[PDB]
Amino acid sequence: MRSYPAIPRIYAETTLNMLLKRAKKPRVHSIDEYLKDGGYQALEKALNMSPEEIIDWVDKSTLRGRGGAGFPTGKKWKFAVQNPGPRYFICNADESEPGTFKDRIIIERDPHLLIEGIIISSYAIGANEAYIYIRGEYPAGYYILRDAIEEAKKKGFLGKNILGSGFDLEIYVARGAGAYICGEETALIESLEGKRGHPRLKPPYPVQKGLWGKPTVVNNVKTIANVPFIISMGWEEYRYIGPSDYAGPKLFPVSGKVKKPGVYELPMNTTLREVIFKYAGGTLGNKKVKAVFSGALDCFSSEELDIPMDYSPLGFGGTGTVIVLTEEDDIVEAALKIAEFYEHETCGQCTPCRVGCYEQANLLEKIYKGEATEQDWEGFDFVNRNIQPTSICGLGAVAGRLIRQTLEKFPEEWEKYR
Amino acid sequence: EFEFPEELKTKLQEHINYFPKKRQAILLCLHEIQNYYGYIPPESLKPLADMLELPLNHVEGVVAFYDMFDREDKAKYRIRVCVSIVCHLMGTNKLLKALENILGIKPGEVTPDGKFKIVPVQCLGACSEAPVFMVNDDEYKFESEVQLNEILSRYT
Numbered sequence: 320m321r322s323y324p325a326i327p328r329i330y331a332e333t334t335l336n337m338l339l340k341r342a343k344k345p346r347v348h349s350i351d352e353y354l355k356d357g358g359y360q361a362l363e364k365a366l367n368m369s370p371e372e373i374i375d376w377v378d379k380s381t382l383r384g385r386g387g388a389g390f391p392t393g394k395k396w397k398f399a400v401q402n403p404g405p406r407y408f409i410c411n412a413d414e415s416e417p418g419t420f421k422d423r424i425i426i427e428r429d430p431h432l433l434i435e436g437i438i439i440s441s442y443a444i445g446a447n448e449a450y451i452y453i454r455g456e457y458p459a460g461y462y463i464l465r466d467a468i469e470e471a472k473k474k475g476f477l478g479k480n481i482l483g484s485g486f487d488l489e490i491y492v493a494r495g496a497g498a499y500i501c502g503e504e505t506a507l508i509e510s511l512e513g514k515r516g517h518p519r520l521k522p523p524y525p526v527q528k529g530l531w532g533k534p535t536v537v538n539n540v541k542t543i544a545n546v547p548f549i550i551s552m553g554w555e556e557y558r559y560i561g562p563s564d565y566a567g568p569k570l571f572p573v574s575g576k577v578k579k580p581g582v583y584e585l586p587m588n589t590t591l592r593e594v595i596f597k598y599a600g601g602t603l604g605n606k607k608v609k610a611v612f613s614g615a616l617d618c619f620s621s622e623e624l625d626i627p628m629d630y631s632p633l634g635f636g637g638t639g640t641v642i643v644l645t646e647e648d649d650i651v652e653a654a655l656k657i658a659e660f661y662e663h664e665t666c667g668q669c670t671p672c673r674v675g676c677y678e679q680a681n682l683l684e685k686i687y688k689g690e691a692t693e694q695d696w697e698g699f700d701f702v703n704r705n706i707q708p709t710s711i712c713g714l715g716a717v718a719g720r721l722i723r724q725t726l727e728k729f730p731e732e733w734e735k736y737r
Numbered sequence: 738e739f740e741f742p743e744e745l746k747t748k749l750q751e752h753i754n755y756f757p758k759k760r761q762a763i764l765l766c767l768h769e770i771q772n773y774y775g776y777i778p779p780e781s782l783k784p785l786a787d788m789l790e791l792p793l794n795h796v797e798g799v800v801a802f803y804d805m806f807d808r809e810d811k812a813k814y815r816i817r818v819c820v821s822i823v824c825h826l827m828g829t830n831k832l833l834k835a836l837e838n839i840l841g842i843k844p845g846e847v848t849p850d851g852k853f854k855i856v857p858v859q860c861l862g863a864c865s866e867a868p869v870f871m872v873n874d875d876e877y878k879f880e881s882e883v884q885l886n887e888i889l890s891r892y893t
């Protein structure tokens with residue numbers, strides 16, 4: 320039996336039986352087991368279709384990006400193909416945001432779903448070279464993908480003239496080495512070109528100018544994973560899954576003070592309360608929910624649990640990452656941990672980001688330890704509001720966001736530190 | 738001067754020949770070097786620069802940017818402990834205390850026999866199984882001191 324590094328068995332549960340159909344089980348599903356559930360047949364179907372028709376189905380699916388900005392996938396592919404080739408396809412598997420551990424279970428348990436979607440996607444946009452960029456702290460995933468890619472090649476789904484279609488593809492797997500910024504799509508590309516992970520000024524978008532200056536689609540693991548399903552069922556059936564306006568399965572990583580922490584494949588009409596109480600089994604010790612941290616992006620109070628988990632103007636949004644804190648949990652100490660993350664992850668290109676992420680964390684620690692001066696307090700307020708100016712990526716745009724929200728929604732807890 | 742052993746230079750070449758361009762293999766090459774020596778030996782950078790057809794400056798800048806790489810301390814086993822939000826809520830401090838009791842060291846430190854180094858890391862992407870730690874490529878939830886002790890005993 321081919322042995323991989325030890326991986327914790329993250330709990331996974333689905334009501335939709337799609338992205339988690341196999342990945343609900345904590346083991347590697349290899350190609351024979353995947354082929355037996357009709358795997359790779361959406362590929363065979365896609366190869367009998369024009370690249371344009373595939374683009375068109377994916378568009379009419381209303382599929383939107385799962386890396387957290389929600390950009391329409393079909394529209395993204397259209398933009399790339401309107402520019403001359405050669406073109407490149409990149410699967411973004413960096414998943415390094417706190418509270419986020421969903422992309423990894425697809426990689427580790429159902430590699431072939433991902434690979435199948437990479438091939439269809441590559442063919443749709445005319446790319447003959449694709450890449451998975453997987454974070455370095457995911458060693459088992461790396462080795463699982465390398466082996467699954469070889470299985471796929473052996474059975475003839477990769478290489479030259481795949482299934483007699485005249486379409487060539489090699490998938491290369493790159494590893495990271497400790498940087499959340501390399502999940503930002505331009506920083507990822509820089510790292511693939513063998514450089515440091517410094518984000519580029521956008522526009523240009525990668526679909527115009529990306530890897531080696533050429534048109535490049537960067538899609539997230541889960542986005543790609545929906546592609547085999549769209550081709551398999553047709554775009555009409557995919558759009559019947561969940562709300563008309565938020566179509567498709569969504570994976571929700573629920574962590575913190577919950578009885579049943581793990582990954583939940585649910586439709587997007589699900590509420591935040593239903594995720595924690597109906598699906599994740601309630602709280603540890605039945606304590607009151609104080610806050611939910613949407614990864615390192617937002618902070619929801621216990622008065623905002625009856626919102627839907629969609630990109631709605633009044634929805635949770637983000638990536639549906641649910642870290643739960645209960646009534647006895649120090650919100651200021653939690654914010655510090657969020658401050659420490661951005662401090663370690665700024666690339667340093669933009670000055671307000673470089674200094675702001677540093678100083679936010681440095682000053683917030685002074686506050687937490689009760690060694691902050693009056694000016695340290697007022698400076699902390701100022702820098703938290705001034706990390707964003709001149710920033711070229713979304714890190715510097717958000718590095719003060721969650722913390723601001725704690726200040727505003729838990730003012731009485733902060734005053735205890737003053 | 739510094740030359741890489743034959744069994745290792747082979748693997749670096751495999752990496753270099755794998756991607757369409759040599760320079761794309763820098764991170765895999767550095768993971769390999771660190772896997773072989775226990776750390777990134779400072780004298781390894783120049784020869785690798787030559788194999789990737791890159792300036793030494795370039796390579797050194799890369800080693801500095803990527804946190805997994807260590808140019809300072811050799812260790813047979815790196816114990817990556819998550820110090821981010823979820824593991825903290827669930828008992829990062831209990832794992833560190835248990836590591837202190839068993840191994841006698843704190844984050845940043847190496848055992849005197851050069852066998853274990855404790856490296857504090859950001860979210861390892863296993864937050865549901867917090868508190869999380871890795872021993873080289875192996876990843877685990879921490880439950881107790883006794884449980885920790887048994888796991889570490891497996892690294893000889």
Ligand SMILES: Cc1cc2c(cc1C)N(C[C@H](O)[C@H](O)[C@H](O)COP(=O)(O)O)c1[nH]c(=O)[nH]c(=O)c1N2
Pocket residue numbers: 383384385386387388389390411412413414415416499500501502503504505537538539540542543712713714
């Ligand atoms: C700081 C930071 C960090 C990340 C990102 C952005 C930023 C600003 N993005 C999103 C990324 O830029 C881009 O939207 C996706 O790669 C394309 O995903 P879709 O497939 O369209 O969702 C991102 N996406 C992803 O797939 N995995 C990740 O780990 C991250 N991390």
Ligand code: SF4
Pocket residue numbers: 500517518664665666667668669670672673710711712713714715716
């Ligand atoms: S905003 Fe921050 S992380 Fe993004 S490019 Fe600028 S310095 Fe780097």
Ligand code: FES
Pocket residue numbers: 417418419819820821822823824825859860861862863864867869
């Ligand atoms: S916060 Fe520790 S693994 Fe995510």
Ligand SMILES: [Cl-]
Pocket residue numbers: 385541568569570
């Ligand atoms: Cl999703």
Ligand code: NA
Pocket residue numbers: 347348349350352
């Ligand atoms: Na199997």
Ligand code: NA
Pocket residue numbers: 413415453454455495496497498499501502
């Ligand atoms: Na990374």
Ligand code: NA
Pocket residue numbers: 663664804859
């Ligand atoms: Na760091």
Ligand code: NA
Pocket residue numbers: 684
């Ligand atoms: Na501290």
Ligand code: NA
Pocket residue numbers: 685690691692695
């Ligand atoms: Na001070």
Ligand code: NA
Pocket residue numbers: 456457861862863876
């Ligand atoms: Na990990």
